[PDB]
Amino acid sequence: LDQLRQEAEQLKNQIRDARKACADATLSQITNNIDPVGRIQMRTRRTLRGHLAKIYAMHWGTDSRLLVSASQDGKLIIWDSYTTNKVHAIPLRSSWVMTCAYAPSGNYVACGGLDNICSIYNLKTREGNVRVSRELAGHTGYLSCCRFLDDNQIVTSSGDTTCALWDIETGQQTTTFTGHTGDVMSLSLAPDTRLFVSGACDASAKLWDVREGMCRQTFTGHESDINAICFFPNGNAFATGSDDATCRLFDLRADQELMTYSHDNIICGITSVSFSKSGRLLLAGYDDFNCNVWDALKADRAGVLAGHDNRVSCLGVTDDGMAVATGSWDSFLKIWN
Amino acid sequence: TLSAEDKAAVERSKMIEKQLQKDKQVYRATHRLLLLGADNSGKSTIVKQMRIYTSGIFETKFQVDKVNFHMFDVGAQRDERRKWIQCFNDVTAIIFVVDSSDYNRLQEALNDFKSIWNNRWLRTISVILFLNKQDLLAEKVLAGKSKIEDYFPEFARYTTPEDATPEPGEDPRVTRAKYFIRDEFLRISTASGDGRHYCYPHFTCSVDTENARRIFNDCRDIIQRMHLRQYELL
């Protein structure tokens, strides 16, 4: 064992020096005088009440009109974001849930929390009720996130270090991703559904391959736990948010850190990060009761989403870019535009 | 200005909101408690006594004087609790069971208790501290084979305070030792209470005729002090 660390350190710092040689110009210098986005004014259009406890996660539908949110009182509610009507309200078996996902096909919703179980609900069925279809129980840690791949494929992230690809029909995990050293907190799928990135409590982010169980790449730029990760619409870059008032941009090709979105006036820690449809705007939700708007190419604060009472927990931008939703711990969803 | 279908859409949303209101009644009339501690401490014995009288979360229900309590015991989970503890930010109280029989773990327990008390997401949350298996503690100390001063070399200098109120039938040696650990836990509790949360230690045992009643009286005090502080009275 003593003959391994000596050469592992040499390999690691070789990687480090090759990485240093790879980069030659800061992206801030490249995008130095192209265009400022200017001040951005966004205001509430609808406010969605009806959640008893606080809410942790929410996911936009693909039709850009429906969204689903999960609360600490054990409730899944599907909204009509146009007419504010409550399309569906689902009671959960476990009151502690930390994530929810909406299927791209629009007929499946999934949730899971401190029960180490990811449950699947089918919205459209011959009978007039939303019920459980499959209960994936193979983890030994709380589920931190989940994302649908198709109508029968899903990837889950657990408090247990492993990330697992599942198979709804057979109810068995096809592939297990074991590369981290702590608890994976978030995972963001690629637009082509071929390579997702996950962030953990070890300040490290890893790009994976769905076809096999191989960790393709690893990024380490932060010092605290990684709390939220998002993928750039182009599919060749991604931004993350950690518990040190900092957001960073990594490129899956250059393998560097491009910008550091932070300000001396911020002490709180990020909770959710999302991108605009064009990728020009970065939206980050903080713990100081309000979200923020960042210029993804100039690294400036160009907008604040002031209205919220408690800490924001989930943030998201709809597929067509019409609006951005925002949940928080005061149990109110606000659609901004 | 709405179609004949949107009228029935709004009607459905009203009956969703009506059912949510009915569910707000049960949610507001129940108190949620979180069990914590270590493996040696007889938490399973505690939950088995009330319940008779890779899941990762176990929930048990008990109600005394027509008010419902729900206790959530964390099941199969990893050692680290940094992340999933911020979720329990709205419980009324934490029930922190501790075993007093063996002396090696006591130092470990103080490390566990100190981190929970000083946590950022658990301020304004009071701890109903328990000391369990007290009968076995008496047996070990009266035998005298195992000393206390070897682990904590202050048992000799320290003397039982006048505030101690022991029942008849117990020698001073048991009372001197029993109240020594209780003050050790409180030594770190008083430092960071900061007029927000309070500790309510007890001296329960493995099997007890009544245990929930201690939680009832502590919970009533816990929120009575919260309301009084809220109305600028306390």
Partner: single-chain antibody, 231 residues
Framework: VQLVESGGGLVQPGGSRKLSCSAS????????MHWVRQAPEKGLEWVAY????????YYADTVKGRFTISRDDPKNTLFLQMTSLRSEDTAMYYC??????????????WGQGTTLTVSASADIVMTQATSSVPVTPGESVSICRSS???????????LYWFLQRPGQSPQLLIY???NLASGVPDRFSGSGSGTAFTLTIRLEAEDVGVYYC?????????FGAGTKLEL
């Protein structure tokens, strides 16, 4: 999802009768319920409507005030009480379930009447152009009767296309003129111009039967005259 209808029988011209539609296999408490009449030798017409939870109730102006529609969720049964029957009310009755929310498909399940034979304005009219068109397997058949623009401000159309197999209950084919109902093959593409509509089909051997439409924009639900396809 299977609901049966009970009642019927020989009745006197002036008496009373009770009609029941007992639901089973679905969450009956979250479904609006309608009643639709179908004359022995004519088209189908609306009768009544009771919302889920009995919040709102409408009636047909033809027999308003002589009929009552009531629910029973505990027992999952629907009732219709008829008083002072006349010769016009002689037909077969269908209880049609429908649920209304974003993306729903109302009027999807009907259920056939079992021995349901009985004895003796500013609306929208949907008199279809034809009543019979020759059909052979291989060629499409299609034929718009709207007295008002069936296009609300939201963006929908509110035209439902039903098909009547010869000898049993109707079925839903297309709702809102562009949405194909579940459980039926490719029978329509999506085409309409606010006031003119058509239903283009390859014809198989089961398509024979009446083929009429409906309106849902305003409170009265007026059906089409009826188009038939024969081999």
């Amino acid at each position: 999802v299977q609901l049966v209808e009970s009642g019927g029988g020989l009745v006197q011209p002036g008496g009373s009768r009770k009609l029941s539609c007992s639901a089973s296999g679905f969450a009956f408490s979250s479904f609006g319920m309608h009643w639709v009449r179908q004359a022995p030798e004519k088209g189908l017409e609306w009768v009544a409507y009771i919302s889920s939870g009995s919040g709102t109730i409408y009636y047909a102006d033809t027999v308003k005030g002589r009929f009552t529609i009531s629910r029973d969720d505990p027992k999952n049964t629907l009732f219709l009480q008829m008083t002072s029957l006349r010769s016009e009310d002689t037909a077969m009755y269908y209880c049609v379930r429908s649920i209304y929310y974003y993306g729903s498909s109302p009027f999807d399940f009907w259920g056939q009447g079992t021995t349901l034979t009985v004895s003796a304005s500013a609306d929208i009219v949907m008199t279809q152009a034809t009543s019979s068109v020759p059909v052979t397997p291989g060629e499409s058949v299609s034929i718009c009767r709207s007295s008002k623009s069936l296009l609300h401000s939201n963006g929908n159309t509110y035209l439902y296309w039903f098909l009547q197999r010869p000898g049993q209950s109707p079925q839903l084919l297309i709702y809102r003129m562009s949405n194909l109902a579940s459980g039926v093959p490719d029978r329509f593409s999506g085409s309409g111009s606010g006031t003119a509509f058509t239903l283009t089909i390859r014809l198989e051997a089961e398509d024979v039967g009446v083929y009429y439409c409906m309106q849902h924009l305003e409170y009265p639900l007026t059906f089409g005259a009826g188009t038939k396809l024969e081999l």
